[PDB]
Amino acid sequence: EKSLHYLYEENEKAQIRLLEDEVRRKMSERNDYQAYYYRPSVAKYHRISKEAADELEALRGD
Amino acid sequence: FDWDRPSYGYFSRAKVIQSAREAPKKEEKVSYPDATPGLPEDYPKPPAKYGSRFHWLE
């Protein structure tokens, strides 16, 4: 029965490892989730420079 | 014509008027119903089944 319990645990671990292999393959194929294969690009600096150019339009003058 | 000359900086200031034509609508924020979603902070996080499941560790 210890062999039965260890075989059940190892078979469920093998099934979860196979399932996470298909999940990681489908995640890296389409780049869908933010966690693993997502290469993050931000538009923060473009918005910062556009906001700064918007404040600089008010300060033009004499 | 009884017109006086304006000052030296009359036309160089900001001029405010009332316009007959209506103003153009501000652009709506772009919508992305299929974005790149992440794990939300209110998502429940139970402990992992069988630990790491990576090379006999748990």
8 Å CB contact of B36 and A16 = no
Three-state SS for A10-57 is HHHHHHHHHHHHHHHHHHHHHCCCCCCCCCCCCCHHHHHHHHHHHHHH
Resolution (in Å) of the shown entry? 3.4
A7 touches chain B (CB under 8 A): no
B43 conformational bin, left if phi > 0, alpha if psi -120 to 50, beta if neither: beta
Which three-class secondary structure state does DSSP give residue A2? helix
DSSP 8-state symbol, A3: H
At position A44, the amino acid (one-letter code) is: K
8 Å CB contact of B37 and A34 = yes
Query: How many CA atoms are closer than 13 Å to the CA of A33, on its beta-carbon side?
Result: 11
Method for structure elucidation: cryo-EM
Residues 6+ apart with CB under 8 A from A26: A32
A vs B: CB pairs below 8 A: 23
8 Å CB contact of B49 and A16 = yes
CB of B50 within 8 A of CB of A5? no
